[PDB]
From a paper:
The eukaryotic 20S proteasome core particle (CP), a barrel‐shaped multicatalytic protease, represents the catalytic core of the UPS. The CP is composed of two identical outer α‐rings and two identical inner β‐rings with total 28 subunits that are arranged in α1‐7β1‐7β1‐7α1‐7 form. Three catalytic subunits β1, β2 and β5 present in each of the inner rings confer distinct caspase‐like (CL), trypsin‐like (TL) and chymotrypsin‐like (ChTL) proteolytic activities, respectively, with the active site threonine at their N‐termini. Given the vital role in many cellular processes, the inhibition of the CP constitutes a promising target for the treatment of diverse diseases.
Subclass II is a collection of novel cinnamic acid and cinnamalacetic acid containing GLNPs exclusively found in the promoter exchange mutant. Thus, the main compounds 3–5, which possess the complete 12‐membered ring structures but contain different aliphatic tails, were investigated for their inhibitory potential against the ChTL activity of yeast CP. As expected, compounds 3–5 showed strong inhibitory activity with IC50 values of 27, 73 and 107 nM, respectively, which are weaker than that of 1 (19 nM) and 2 (4 nM). As shown, compounds 3–5 do not bind to the CL active site at β1, because the structural conformation of GLNPs displace the peptide backbone of the ligand from the proper alignment with the active site cleft. However, the electron density maps reveal that 3−5 covalently bind to the β2 and β5 active site Thr‐1Oγ and develop hydrogen bonding interactions with the oxyanion hole Gly47 N (residue numbers are allocated on the basis of the alignment to the β‐subunit of Thermoplasma acidophilum). These prearrangements facilitate the Michael‐type 1,4‐reaction of the Thr‐1Oγ to the double bond of the GLNPs, located at C4 in the 12‐membered ring system. In contrast, GLNPs have the highest binding affinity to the ChTL active site at β5. In addition, the P1‐alanine side chain forms strong hydrophobic interactions with β5‐Met45 and the P3‐threonine moiety is hydrogen bonded to Asp114 and Ser118 of the adjacent β6 subunit. While all these interactions are uniform in each of the bound GLNPs, differences between 3−5 are found in their individual aliphatic tails. As expected, the yCP:5 structure shows that the phenyl moiety of the shortest ligand does not form prominent interactions with the protein side chains, which is in agreement with its low binding affinity, resulting in its 27‐fold higher IC50 value compared to 2.
Numbering used by the authors:
A (entry chain J): 1 to 195
B (entry chain E): 3 to 233
C (entry chain G): 2 to 242
D (entry chain C): 1 to 240
E (entry chain F): 2 to 244
F (entry chain A): 1 to 250
G (entry chain D): 1 to 117, 125 to 242
H (entry chain L): 1 to 111
Amino acid sequence: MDIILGIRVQDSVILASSKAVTRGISVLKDSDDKTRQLSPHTLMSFAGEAGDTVQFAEYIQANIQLYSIREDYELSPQAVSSFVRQELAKSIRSRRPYQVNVLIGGYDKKKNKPELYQIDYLGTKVELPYGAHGYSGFYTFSLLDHHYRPDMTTEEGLDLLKLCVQELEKRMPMDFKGVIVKIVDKDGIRQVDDF
Amino acid sequence: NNYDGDTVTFSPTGRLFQVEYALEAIKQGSVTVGLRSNTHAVLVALKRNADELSSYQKKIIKCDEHMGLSLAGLAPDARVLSNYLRQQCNYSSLVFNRKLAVERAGHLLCDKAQKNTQSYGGRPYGVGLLIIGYDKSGAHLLEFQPSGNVTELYGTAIGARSQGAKTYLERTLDTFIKIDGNPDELIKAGVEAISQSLRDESLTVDNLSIAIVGKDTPFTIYDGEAVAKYI
Amino acid sequence: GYDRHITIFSPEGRLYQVEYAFKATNQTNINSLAVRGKDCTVVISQKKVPDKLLDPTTVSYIFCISRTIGMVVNGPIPDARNAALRAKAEAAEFRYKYGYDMPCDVLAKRMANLSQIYTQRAYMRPLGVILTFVSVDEELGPSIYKTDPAGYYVGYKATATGPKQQEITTNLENHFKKSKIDHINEESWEKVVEFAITHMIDALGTEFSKNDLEVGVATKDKFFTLSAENIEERLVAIAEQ
Amino acid sequence: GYDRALSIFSPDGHIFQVEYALEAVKRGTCAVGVKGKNCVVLGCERRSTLKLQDTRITPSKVSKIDSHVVLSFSGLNADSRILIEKARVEAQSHRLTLEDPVTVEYLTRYVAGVQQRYTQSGGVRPFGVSTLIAGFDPRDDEPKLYQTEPSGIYSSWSAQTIGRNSKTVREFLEKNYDRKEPPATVEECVKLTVRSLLEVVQTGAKNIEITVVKPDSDIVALSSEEINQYVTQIEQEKQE
Amino acid sequence: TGYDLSNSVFSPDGRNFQVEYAVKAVENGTTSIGIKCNDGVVFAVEKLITSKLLVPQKNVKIQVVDRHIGCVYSGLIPDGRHLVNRGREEAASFKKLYKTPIPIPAFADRLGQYVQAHTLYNSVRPFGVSTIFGGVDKNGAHLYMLEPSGSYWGYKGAATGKGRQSAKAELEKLVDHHPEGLSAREAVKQAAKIIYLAHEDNKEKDFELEISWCSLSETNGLHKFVKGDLLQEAIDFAQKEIN
Amino acid sequence: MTDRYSFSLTTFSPSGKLGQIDYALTAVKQGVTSLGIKATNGVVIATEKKSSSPLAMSETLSKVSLLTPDIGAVYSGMGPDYRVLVDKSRKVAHTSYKRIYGEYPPTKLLVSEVAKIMQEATQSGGVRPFGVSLLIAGHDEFNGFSLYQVDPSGSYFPWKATAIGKGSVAAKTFLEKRWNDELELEDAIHIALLTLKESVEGEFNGDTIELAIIGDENPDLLGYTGIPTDKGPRFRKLTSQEINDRLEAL
Amino acid sequence: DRGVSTFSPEGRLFQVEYSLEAIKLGSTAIGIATKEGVVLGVEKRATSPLLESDSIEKIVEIDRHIGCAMSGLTADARSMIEHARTAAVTHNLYYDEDINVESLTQSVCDLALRFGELMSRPFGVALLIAGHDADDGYQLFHAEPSGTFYRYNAKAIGSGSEGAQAELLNEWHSSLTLKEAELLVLKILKQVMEEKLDENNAQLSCITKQDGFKIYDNEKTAELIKELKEKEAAE
Amino acid sequence: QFNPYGDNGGTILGIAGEDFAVLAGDTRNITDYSINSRYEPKVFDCGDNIVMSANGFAADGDALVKRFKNSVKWYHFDHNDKKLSINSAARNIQHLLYGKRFFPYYVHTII
Amino acid sequence: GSRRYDSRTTIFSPEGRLYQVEYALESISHAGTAIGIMASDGIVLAAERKVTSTLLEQDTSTEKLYKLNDKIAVAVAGLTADAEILINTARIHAQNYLKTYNEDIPVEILVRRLSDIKQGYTQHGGLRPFGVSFIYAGYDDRYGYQLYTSNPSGNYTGWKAISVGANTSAAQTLLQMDYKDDMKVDDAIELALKTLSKTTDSSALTYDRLEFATIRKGANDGEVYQKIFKPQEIKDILVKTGIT
Ligand SMILES: [Cl-]
Ligand SMILES: [Mg+2]
């Protein structure tokens, strides 16, 4: 898959992910949601090799849901990201590795803090204020470096995200058919239906 | 007594009671007769029903175009052993383009049964088999016991009341061995032999099971109105 | 009372199957003896061929384990040959792995450790044998090491095994009490064999023909058994003084 | 591996290990299940031989298998954890492959299948546990209540009890539960469940647990005071 | 007590009663013998004719191992067959690795260790056969006899089964009266006689004689069955001696 | 074949006793007396060389065994069981420690590993417990000198001084009167010889007594020079002559 | 103790003979084969009135052309059914056709004697396997834990079996209609059942060539019970 | 490097009539520019009124026909001597061929 | 064959009890008493060593109290060797959890894991159960201070105060009498020692016959400290509480 962005503002994490699915010659779909809810306050967006992406995302989702039922407790975003990293770090030395890159956006209800983790297919984890995978960072990071503030509102974060998407739509060769945007905050996960 | 808990235990007189108890299951089974001439070999089997609504349990199993057996005792064990014979007959054809000799088939059955008599956990086979066949050395008849003992014979019988048929064949030995090139007369001799083991019941159309193999005769089984000719 | 059938502790802290394996040891009714010279180690054993239909050349309880190591067994022949084959395999493997010939005491320890395992693991029975290993070791010199069904082993100045071991043992003990040395002070192995046979005759109170004995000799770099005619020469020398 | 056949037939056609597993269930604390018109209630006995217990952290008797299905039990507590874990894994495995949560009947069938397997596998003894599995199928408002036992047989129940003195509370339910008109509300259903346990329990204090399951993953456990109000109202009507 | 209920249990004597019970099965079997001659060995066996319905000459008891070893046994016939099958595997692997056909003493230990292994565990039953076997190798003729315990020795003559005492006495005469040795053709004749004489212990039913031999001069060191005119000549010689 | 004893041969009886462990302890009770005493600057372990025959060379049978350069062991009970435990203990010191950390294990952890092997023979399928009690003496940099007892059950305890086997009850009483926290190594050896004399019937000399110490580093026993940090083994087995010298001052 | 695969002195496997005793304790199941179809019927036998009887599933579909009824330790039947369903579907996958009823029965019966020290004990359940194929028409088999199977024109298994079998002896003829067979199963079930027979404690099913295997509704069976009552009162 | 496949040439032809069918094939067997045989039968009667030919690599062709013939034999054993219909044979052959999906039988089969 | 000698350690009695579990519990009832008491500001673990000697090196000795990680400790009653097997398994499980989630293992998850291991030995494998009962004292940020126990059956339960080993009946009555919910660690220390002092089979309770440990948020600010008491420190707390 192509473009996945993430930005952590004052009180929420915002994940933007492209809608296009291209199989070589044609664009098969223009409404694809490249994300899974792992728990009520944790969202994971993903991009990489076809098939492996969804297979990995659903496998993680199943494991976190299992943990939630067993303990009657939601794992922290930090804990979920560490679990995910280990799975990818295990995967990289397998017979056939998962070729999947992820962003994990979560709201920690204990600390009352949004958290954004960027993890590539090797199992390389970093906590960031804003992140991306693939070529998305090359276009967007210069804008985010300039405009980002840690005390931004969710509305300001969405406006900065629009500016990022506009720059991508101008300078990227591939038509990624716009983005689905989702917000993760204290009240859970919701989708911005107009973007 | 104290030495019949498993097959791995000899008694103080050198007996294997589990094997002897497996031998007893054959004596409870229905009678079946085997006999041969120089050209043909015949199996005759009295099939047993559960009641008047039930079918008559099949006694004869084909192993190849030139070989097959009749059973007496545990029918599932016969299925296991006959399946093994089918495989060995088939291995011989596929690998060596060679029909399996009846004598060699006996040796393979002996060795398969033996392993179940010397190891812990297992149990002996609870069935006796009469194998007939026509190979490169002519017609053959074998008697298999689950002790492992396999014996080549002109004629024999196994099952309940088999002693009557066995005595008859022992008298008729010189006559039926000479029935060459006459399948019907050899079957007649087998039907007359199995009749010496009947009491109260007689041979009906769904009671009797006959099989034959010979010089220019593939192993074929006759049941139903195909055996009314011999009643 | 299943503590008597398998190798588990009885209430007295005893292993009855081990004790009964020691009794199986004397089932052959054969007595062996081993002694050390200056340059050699000699082992003698009684030979009994009760059946005239037997080929007497094939009746033996002495085994050539390796070039340097010989082994005499006290116990039934099936268990004896079981132990022999294993010892041979172990000795060969040792040389391959470590690049030198397996010492007599090390092989004894190895076989003893195997015997110990049978006294601890239930599925394996003890072997009903006592194994006397002999060599002229390149480091320790003349060597006698003996293993039993308990998994015990130790080195010996001299030793005796069998139904009448005590009579032979006391006879040997008394000799070494006189001489005050740990071996037979003799140059040739021929005279050490003559000593061994003489002291068995004295201890048991029986005379021997050439066919009543079986002799093994260990020297530097080889162990070998004597023929009936080699033993006859030995018996002639004893009688002539 | 240890292969010994522990569960075997006896001359009279009984598998004693399975029957002795039922005797362990008979020893366990009483559990009861009652389904209303739009809910299922699971009631559970807590023996008051153990005080100085920390009730915050002590394993609760009713366990969520998924967000929409619960499991209670009577018998060996340690054995029940193995069934609950397997059930929870299977529930997530079903969501992963079928893209739909388990039906209550499916989950029951799975647990019952595990229990059966342990009655004819070598080297293992049967589970000393009977279960009550309750909930609502996805996008369905019909209440579901099933029972399993060590043998592996399972069946659906309008109301059922298991464990010690379950004969007495089943006697109560058989005369007090009408099939033509089940407990129409949550209140009526909880009341009938508390009433049934009060036939057996002793004190109505911390000895009764109640869990209410409603459609669309709406599961809540009642507190001590909420249950104590039912206990108070039942006996005040009884004084007459 | 209880020491005889399980294989590999030492009794308080130091005995394995299960092995001793296997011997009883051997003693119950038909008589079989072995005679070591000048340049080979002769094997013979008593085959009881249970019924007229047994096909004469068909139920062969003596078994070849490799091309140079003969095996005959008394007791549980299937156990004997199992032992020979193993013997054939051992003889095959030996020849595969070392090129030369397995020597007879080497082969004897291969059977010996295998039979002994079935006295080490309670999960297996001892062999219910004594086996007489041998043949010709590079060092000449060898005859062996192997018991349920795993015990074996080399023999000048050997016998086992129901008529073993009778046979042994006859063999002991041959050893005394022929210190220089016996020819292969003499040994076939003598083998026939000994089986006929040993048939007095099984006198109720009549029997069928079966003989085989390996001889350096007479069979080129290969195992062969005695057939036709040479078999009939030995039967006639045997029948003449009993009358 | 196959090992078809995949079940425990040691089980709880109705009274809560593990029969096979108790019986193993009984076998230890019948065994020859051995003891251990800890001093300020060392540890001593000692036992009687009960020779089975006078024709046997009792020097070839080592009852006191080096496990590591700074750890030694002695036993009471079944000798063969001891011998295989020493083999396993030496190996585990390498596999589970030296090949990982590049140094020999501390006394308490090697004891822990031996204990684990003995515990497994008490629960695993188709085996009996070990019929020995071990006394393990040793030194390491951070724990100093130490002495441990290990029983058939796998349980182990540290001691200032103790005795096991035949006359342990009397020997432990003797040690209680003599032991103090100011003993030098020579004082402990003296006490060890005094204590051991009580349980010995026959000959009492350097040839019938086996005695070893954990004491100062022995650079003369290292086998090489040139590395300052390698100063040699603290385990030393006393010679026949060295024992007899201390029996004159007895 | 003693081996699980041990033979008795009479030449019978102890465990197999004991499992047959468990089947005698089981609820009654009856099958009747006609030229118009095979009928299968069972006693449900709910242990309590609070047990919802429609969850008692003692008649089961194996394929469209094969049904099955059970009696004994019914939990044991689940893995047998699973195997049967798999075998039926697998054979269709390999051969693009329906599997013969006998071949399906044989496949199930191969599991029976796979016990020892494989599963730890025989199955404690007997099966009536009914079906249709083109070669042998409408068939009814009785599959035991011995590994033996008999074909039957009619058969009863479970606690009322010998009483029922004697009744089936008199009543069965080669010209029975499907409707006649339905009533006959209901009649004989009513005879051997402890409780009074109705649509909630007994269940009917049938297999026809046209419509395949069908479990009857409680409303459909209720009408056949009422039809039975009237025709018995008719003389 | 070892090449497990080869090409034995040949050509086969099947035609379905109204109440009959023919399966024809040339009898020449080749490698490269050499003739191995001028008469090596390629079309086989497999029993049950079915004829088969597996043309291409003759080793794989002979193996497949041998296995199908064997499948017919075991179909009779396992299903009471039932005649294997042509459609059922076809499905059975698909499974024989697909069983070696990742090391294929290098043949074009016609029945 | 081998069946003859099999005790069958994993079977039900006719009454539906597990023979070996019951007999293992009987073993445990002869072990030294261990007591756990949970307060608002910490947990106490007190345990009696079994009939010691004057020649036992006490300062380097550990038979009762073991550290599983920095937040969780256990008190042991039963076979010490058996306990150490399980303790090492538990220590690994805690570190596996820490490696995976980068958070310390919650107390109940560790307890459940060990308890499930014990359960396995009662249902399959034909081996004898572990003759051990644990008291788990621990802290995590979800439930705070927690006390649990597990026994050879693999069943575990949570407690405010609990005893295992010898004289648990007498000990539990005394704890039930004097325990209150608003109690503090210093009070709980006193209760634990007073309870052991009354239930002990020894003539008097001295420092050399005790092992003692506290888990306190008495660690400078927002963290938890485990204190395994030294012999001299046990002697001091015995004088402070007025027992010696
Ligand atoms: Cl070793
Ligand atoms: Mg043993």
